[PDB]
Amino acid sequence: LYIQWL
């Protein structure tokens, strides 16, 4: 799993 929020 990889999550990014910017």
Numbering used by the authors: 1 to 6
Source paper text:
Here, we identify an evolutionarily conserved hexapeptide sequence as the major aggregation-prone region (APR) of gastrointestinal peptides of the glucagon family: xFxxWL. We determine nine polymorphic crystal structures of the APR segments of glucagon-like peptides 1 and 2, and exendin and its derivatives. Our results highlight the dual role of short aggregation core motifs in reversible amyloid formation and receptor binding.
APRTc5b does not contain gatekeeper residues and is thus capable of amyloid formation over a broad range of pH (2 < pH < 11). Four polymorphic crystal forms were grown from solutions of APRTc5b. Although the chains in polymorph B are also arranged according to the class 8 topology, different interactions stabilize the interfaces.
